[PDB]
Amino acid sequence: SLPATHELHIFGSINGIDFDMVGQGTGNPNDGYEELNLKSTMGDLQFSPWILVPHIFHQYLPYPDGMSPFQAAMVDGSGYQVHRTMQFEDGATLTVNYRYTYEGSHIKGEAQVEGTGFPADGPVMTNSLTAEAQMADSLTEEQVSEYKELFSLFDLDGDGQITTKELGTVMRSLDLNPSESELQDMINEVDAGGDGTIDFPEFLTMMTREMKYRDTEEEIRELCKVFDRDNDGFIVAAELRHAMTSIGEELTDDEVDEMIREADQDGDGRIDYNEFVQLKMQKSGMRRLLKKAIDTVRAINRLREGMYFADWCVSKKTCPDDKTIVSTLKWAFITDNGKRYRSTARTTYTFAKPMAANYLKNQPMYVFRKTELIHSKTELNFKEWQKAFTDGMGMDELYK
Ligand SMILES: [Ca+2]
Ligand SMILES: [Ca+2]
Ligand SMILES: [Ca+2]
Ligand SMILES: [Ca+2]
Query: Could you give the CA distance from residue 276 to residue 220 in angstroms, rounded to a whole number?
Result: 8
User: How many Å lie between the centroid of ligand 2 and the Cα of residue 160?
Assistant: 10
User: How many Å lie between the centroid of ligand 4 and the Cα of residue 274?
Assistant: 9
What is each CA distance from 236 to 44, 119, 272, 303, in whole angstroms?
A: 56, 43, 9, 28
User: How many Å lie between the centroid of ligand 3 and the Cα of residue 154?
Assistant: 27
User: How many Å lie between the centroid of ligand 2 and the Cα of residue 350?
Assistant: 47
Chain centroid to Cα 63, Å, comes to 22
Radius of gyration of the CA atoms of the chain, in A: 24
User: How many Å lie between the centroid of ligand 4 and the Cα of residue 221?
Assistant: 16
Ligand closest to 198 (CA) is: 2
Ligand closest to 164 (CA) is: 1
Query: Could you give the CA distance from residue 164 to residue 196 in angstroms, rounded to a whole number?
Result: 8
User: How many Å lie between the centroid of ligand 4 and the Cα of residue 224?
Assistant: 14
Query: Could you give the CA distance from residue 174 to residue 226 in angstroms, rounded to a whole number?
Result: 11
User: How many Å lie between the centroid of ligand 1 and the Cα of residue 136?
Assistant: 28
Strand partners, 276: none
**Phi/psi of residue 241, nearest 5 degrees:** -65, -40
The experimental method, as deposited, was X-ray
**Phi/psi of residue 202, nearest 5 degrees:** -60, -35
Resolution, in Å, please? 2.4
Cβ neighbours around 159 below 10 Å, total: 11
User: How many Å lie between the centroid of ligand 1 and the Cα of residue 184?
Assistant: 15
Q: Domains of the chain, with CATH numbers? A: 5-131+310-398 (2.40.155.10), 141-209+214-307 (1.10.238.10)
Ion ligand 2 residues within 5 Å by Cβ: 191, 193, 195, 197, 199
Cβ density class 49-84: b for 16+ within 10 Å, e for less: bbbbbbbbbbbbbbbeeebbbbbbbbeeeebbebeb
Ion ligand 1 residues within 5 Å by Cβ: 155, 157, 159, 161
User: How many Å lie between the centroid of ligand 3 and the Cα of residue 241?
Assistant: 12
